[PDB]
Design a protein around this ligand. Sequence first.
Ligand SMILES: [Mg+2]
Lengths: 167, 128, 231, 59, 33, 493, 350, 64
Amino acid sequence: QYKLSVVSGGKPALNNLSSVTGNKNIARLSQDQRNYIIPFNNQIKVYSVETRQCVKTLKFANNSLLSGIFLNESIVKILLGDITVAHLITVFTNNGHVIVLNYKGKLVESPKHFKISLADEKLANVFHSEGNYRILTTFKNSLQSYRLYALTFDDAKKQFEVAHQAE
Amino acid sequence: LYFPHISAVQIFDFYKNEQVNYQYLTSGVNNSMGKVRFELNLQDPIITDLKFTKDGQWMITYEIEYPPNDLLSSKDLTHILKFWTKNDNETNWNLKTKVINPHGISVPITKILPSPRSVNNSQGCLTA
Amino acid sequence: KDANASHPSHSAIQSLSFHPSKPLLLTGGYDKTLRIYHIDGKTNHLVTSLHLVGSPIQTCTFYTSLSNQNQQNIFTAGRRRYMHSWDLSQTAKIEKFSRLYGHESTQRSFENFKVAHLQNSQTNSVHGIVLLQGNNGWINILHSTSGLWLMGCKIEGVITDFCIDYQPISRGKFRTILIAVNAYGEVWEFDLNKNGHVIRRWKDQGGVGITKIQVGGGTTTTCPALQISKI
Amino acid sequence: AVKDALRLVHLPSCSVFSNWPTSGTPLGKVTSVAFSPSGGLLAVGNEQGKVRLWKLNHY
Amino acid sequence: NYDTDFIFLDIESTLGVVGTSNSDIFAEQLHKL
Amino acid sequence: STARPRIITSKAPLLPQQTTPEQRYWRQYTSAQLVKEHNSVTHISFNPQHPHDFAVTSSTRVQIFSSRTRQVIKTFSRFKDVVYSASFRSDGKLLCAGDATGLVSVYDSYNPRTILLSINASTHPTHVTKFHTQDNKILATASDDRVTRLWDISNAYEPQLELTGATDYVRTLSFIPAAPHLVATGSYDGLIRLYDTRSSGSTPIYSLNHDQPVENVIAVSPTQIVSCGGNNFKVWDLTSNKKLYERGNFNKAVTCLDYVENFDSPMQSALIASSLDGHVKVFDPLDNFQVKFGWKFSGPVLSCAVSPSTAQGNRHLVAGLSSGLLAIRTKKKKSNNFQRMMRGSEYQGDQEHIIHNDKVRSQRRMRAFERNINQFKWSEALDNAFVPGMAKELTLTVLQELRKRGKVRVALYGRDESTLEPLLNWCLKGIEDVRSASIVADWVAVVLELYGNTLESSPVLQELMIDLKTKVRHEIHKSKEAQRIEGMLQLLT
Amino acid sequence: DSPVLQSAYDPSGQYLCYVTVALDKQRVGVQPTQRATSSGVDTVWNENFLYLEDSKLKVTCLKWVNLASSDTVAIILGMNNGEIWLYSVLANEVTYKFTTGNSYEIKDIDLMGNQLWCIDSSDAFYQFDLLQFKLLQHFRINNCVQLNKLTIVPAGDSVAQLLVASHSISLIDIEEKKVVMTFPGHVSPVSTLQVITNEFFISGAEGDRFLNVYDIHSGMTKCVLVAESDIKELSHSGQADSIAVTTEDGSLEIFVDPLVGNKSKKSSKKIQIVSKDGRKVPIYNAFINKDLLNVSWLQNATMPYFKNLQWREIPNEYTVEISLNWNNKNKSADRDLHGKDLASATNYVE
Amino acid sequence: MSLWQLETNSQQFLPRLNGIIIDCQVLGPQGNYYSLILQMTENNSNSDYQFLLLNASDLTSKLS
RNA sequence: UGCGAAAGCAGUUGAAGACAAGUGCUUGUCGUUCGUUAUAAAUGGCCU
Ligand SMILES: [Mg+2]
């Protein structure tokens, strides 16, 4: 007769790392600068700046991969477009799952899920300038140590390879 | 959905899953200045209870104002009760009456119960 | 056929401007209205009008960013302490500039202004600058979009008028030179690409009571460029 | 200042044009002037609120 | 809630609820431009 | 971002007998001129039309007072013996008056020389002469002959109708609005007799018992008639023919009564009733005729009137006294070439497609003390609190705001005896009132804790504390008394 | 009185081509009449235009090349230079330029498959082949002193005779190069000469409120259709099922079964556009296929808009109501009614 | 929020924000938008973040 | 800190490691740990 279901959203997600400051924000503004993508704890919202309304919601519960992955892991970054390859985004979570989703449309039930290889490392941040990608990750006085790898996607193996650059 | 935030009420629409409003329902240093160092120890009034009449036009609030520290009057909490009203189209509640120290001095208003529809056509309440 | 027959103006036509590419004409006046007309030469109907309550219109101009040609905007000012910008139809996106970032003393009215293109050479990006007239020889230079205060330029005596010139350097490089004149006739020439530093001074022979200064034969507010190679 | 106070100058001859404007041309107190980027249109506003438009056949 | 359903709030601030053809190509090319 | 809150003036809980919106309007009848007349002013009336000059009957003369000037503009002295009324006609063109001789004279208002019609109503005195409100031509007359003849201006030789039946002096005639046929008269018999002119007449349709001699009868509304007699006034309903209300606040015998409706007051309708005790008080018909205001005058009040509904200018309240004193209270109510150069400011964008307004409304200028709090000038905000001619309520705030901000010690650091005296002097006065007693208790404690040493070496401050110590002690005694009374009451209940 | 000098629907009725002047130069543009495509993607304004680089140059007649017949959607434009241009809308460029030896302006053009016909101010006919890009023949017929219009009869899959018009109308055979019949036309020059069906072509003239329906085989006026005001543009439905005329005063009139007292028939359904405030918006073109009627009107100055309506259910006199900006209070999405920033928290005021 | 002008060491202010500013950034090719994170430290029970996006032209909340 | 009424009724504020300064000793410190329910003070104040 009765049934239980989640309805609303929740607090916005943050880069809950004491060491990093000035990078606590993980939301991004589209390349065309017409909509803002904000990750929550339980969903990802896309708001249209011009109209100030929520044009799209990508709920973790609905999709299978997102439900398994996030429902603890959190989005450590969002990159506009897709690295492997016009409304695509790539979500990097702390454990290492890299998920290619689409806003402005209907979410596809099989996103191009991948997994970076990390050995006892918690991914902290990722970033790029021009087709070049570097990932910063934490390994372990109560002070964590950091490592900087170089990330590239190889088409033949369709895998993310990490090469050590700095410590 | 009405959230009694400290010194304020946040009105949130869960059908649309957004906030609609954020109104300060107390006096106190709320947004007049940014508290820093010792001023940060001040405690703004706290909305303990908030309730609506059945008809839905009247808003009852109960607030506790905390005196500052290190004064003679630093142990006499002030209990305030307020009645607000608004039309459906409007989005800001307007304060209509204010009772200072109901039931006596320093005696809390633990409970508020708006009246049923029969008595005064839902324009009443009980305080305990 | 006269342009204003389609919809008359109730006050003087304080400023006129032709859109850089489209066939549109903008008029303003102390009527506090912004009328845009579609000049065909035979009908000249009214595209739109915009009433700015309590903002007497002293000068207006279209603005098209030199890089992102899709960007179109209208800057308007008056004998007031705030400037309006209209980005380009149910509603209008109008922005109000009313912050000078610590130089409110030098600028108590925006009524005189002009818009030009500045190339930040260390990054090779190009943006818009809105130039203003101060109290005593002060020329304020604002970022067109963000509204930030970039630099300020000073001359001796009462500033009367100024005009903007572009000087190409190489492929994709151009410098903005701000020419200002005093009521007596001294002409300064600032280089806005080197922090507003004077580069040359001269006098207009037999100049007294100078009122307006203008340049022509190339790019300018009236004949704007559409790409860097056209400067 | 005064009505019909407008003149056009050829360059680099710097010789003012003689045929236009004439006594009968309507200009009023010219208070704003604007050239079109192309097509050689000339719009001249006046204190009465009228923007009278001319065409330069050469362009 | 005053309809049949009930709402509840989680410390994750999550409000759950308990309750009972050449023309066709031409159109595409035109839209692309 | 948000605009700064405006500092909220303190408001202590409402005390009894607050100013009501009815009182606030009626207190604006400020300007008072007392004029003296030879004899008692018996009757007062207002011209129904602009400029609404009002006529006063005194001794053998009638005087018309201009509304704006408040001075005599016309004088009618032809009357040989005393005059008893000055009612205007509905149009306001004519003025009718009576005499002790009994003749009724109709003059053209604003032309005292011309007499239009003279009627010998009766050999006895003719006290009341009123025109009919609905119909212009028919004029009514009341005599001590106890017959209220109904005159016609066209035919003066014989009355159109002659109502009778009263066994005592008739001094009150009223015409009911919307029922022109009906006529209402009141006698000192204690009976209000209602007659119908459409019928044969001469016998009342029915009588209403007032139980005391009736001094004036006024038709408040088409269905209600209020009559003031003896020590009370009672409102009657004709449909039911019974009294809806009666009010006995008055002490002396009410004498005159007037009614006004639909004027710019908060109270829609007002009933002013003379007292003969020097009082003329206002009653509200929408509220079961409850009092809302009153004035007191030197002697008994024999006539009252208020300016008509369509005053179209400064309103007037007029009262008449038996000593002859007349009391008036009034509620007072470049170059062308340049202009062409700037002709656009008038435009409000009625023909434009889009109207865009961003100007923020002008806020009231903020006082000096608020400027100092907003700029975080704690100490100066305290000084501004105690300045000469500073309203008490405003001062109490800037003490409260500083305490609420948590800046009490901070505002009292850089101070000596020269600059501490003003604070204590206020505190010397603030300690008395109940509202500021708690706040002064707080500040006084701090300055002691912070200026104990300074106090010893300064003799002036020492006196300030002795005087303060005296008055705080006196306050203890008052509060202690209040407790004993409070305990005393609980015993009774 | 209208900025749109010349307009023309495509055969399907989905795309409208209109020419208008920008400063001293004419520009040609093509825009999608339907609100939304079949795929459901919303139609958008087409900013691409073709600018005539010469001020003197002007577009005299425009004709659509049928979308289905040819791979590339194209529009043929006649110009006052005396040369005809083939315009492919996608490339936004004139693909090929048909030039006649003479310089006189083209007064009319019409097309059937490969056959392309034009007439000049010198009263000379011409032929052209789209595929081969050549001038086949050019000839001048006697007793044709003006030729304001041209239409090639829809006979089989070849052109066997042509309809040409001046103050009077004429029918000519290609092979014999001589007139066949002459019809009494209008007093003023003929404006529209569209062929409704076999042996029935309608005629209208500049500054005239009447249309004559002429039989090709016989030559008697079958009927005279009457408009409330002058006639500017014409479109017929199916085979004489219904006729839509764009009147000069800005109203659209519909004749229902005009080919069925009888001699002079009046329009049955009259359509008009009026904005909410009260201003009337004139209509400058229309198209009617089976039961859908398309009405195009100009907003702003040259921004064309469109609406699709089912004329069958429409009452006799029907006025569409459109929202046009007028004294519109500008509401910015980041302010409330009182201009306060939406993010701001409302203050406490006793 | 304080914008320090480093040329002349001056400053411009955006005061009375809803909470203390945990983070600031300039987000755009021409610095069109300022992105802020607010905390609302009043609620000591929970960390109540609010994300603001301000238009740099007039310092007004483009998206809250 | 626990309980409670708001008043109060009971109970806490320990130990290690490391660094700095003065002279192995003394004091102060902790973006170090274990365990227990467990003054401030860089001249530094809020736009149009
Ligand atoms: Mg003259």
